[PDB]
Design a protein around this ligand. Structure first.
Ligand SMILES: O=C1Cc2cc(Nc3ncncc3Cl)ccc2N1
Ligand SMILES: O=C1Cc2cc(Nc3ncncc3Cl)ccc2N1
Ligand SMILES: [Cl-]
Ligand SMILES: [Cl-]
Lengths: 4, 124, 124, 4
């Protein structure tokens, strides 16, 4: 999971 | 927004759509190419091809379970492109590049047409 | 094999599937949650959720155009998860995390359950 | 396009  | 994003989500979705295709689960159309038949999901074909997008948004054709491609279309070129739609992988070879590019132009798959043009230009 | 791969293909496919959802094109099922209705594509729901995979591979349920979820399911949690299925983006907030995790457990969306568990553990 |  990432900060888009 | 303040959303988080799962990097592998889109690839995992496409992998699962290809697993459904392999097992012939919920396929809703047959594409006929020079008497070679290919089962697929209309939505995946629309998501990948300007031609299929135009076909399945037509009020009459959206309801067809069989679509016949132009007789000039090569079944192998179609098969390679159908595999690409469901996998992101294109089996481009010296022996198939002309058929693949011609099929991608007809199907309106602009990124495929682009890499074929570049691979052809490198060999001239 | 000796395939080439188009990096953005899977993301572009999912973006187009979400555009079809927005325009209600080729949606083939309604998901009913506490009298809130959500139109979707069965194949996308199957590709994202172990529950929908099990439902639409059932010989009788594969033919249903309406699926009613358990009354304990929260429509907002479902809406957030449906958006995630079609975009890879999860709108996870302090005010919705419990409903989102409960819905992801019911839908069998293991990666979502994982990030919810981790975000909850960080706040304890 | 890349070599996967
Ligand atoms: O090269 C290409 C690939 C491609 C896909 C589509 N598909 C869609 N476009 C927009 N909204 C939904 C969909 Cl399904 C249309 C044109 C082209 N042209
Ligand atoms: O967490 C999850 C996400 C998920 C998706 C599916 N889907 C499929 N699996 C295998 N072949 C085809 C499909 Cl469509 C099954 C279980 C789970 N569990
Ligand atoms: Cl393309
Ligand atoms: Cl997930």
């Amino acid at each position: 999971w990432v900060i888009p | 927004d303040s959303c988080i994003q799962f990097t592998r989500h889109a690839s995992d979705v496409l992998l699962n759509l290809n697993r459904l295709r392999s097992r012939d689960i919920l396929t809703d159309v047959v594409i006929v190419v020079s008497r070679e038949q290919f089962r697929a999901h209309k939505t995946v074909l629309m998501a990948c091809s300007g031609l299929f997008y135009s076909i399945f948004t037509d009020q009459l054709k959206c309801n067809l379970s069989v679509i016949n491609l132009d007789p000039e279309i090569n079944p192998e070129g179609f098969c390679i492109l159908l595999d690409f739609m469901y996998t992101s992988r294109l089996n481009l070879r010296e022996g198939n590049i002309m058929a693949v590019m011609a099929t991608a132009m007809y199907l309106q798959m602009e990124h495929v047409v682009d890499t074929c043009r570049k691979f052809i230009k490198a060999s001239e």
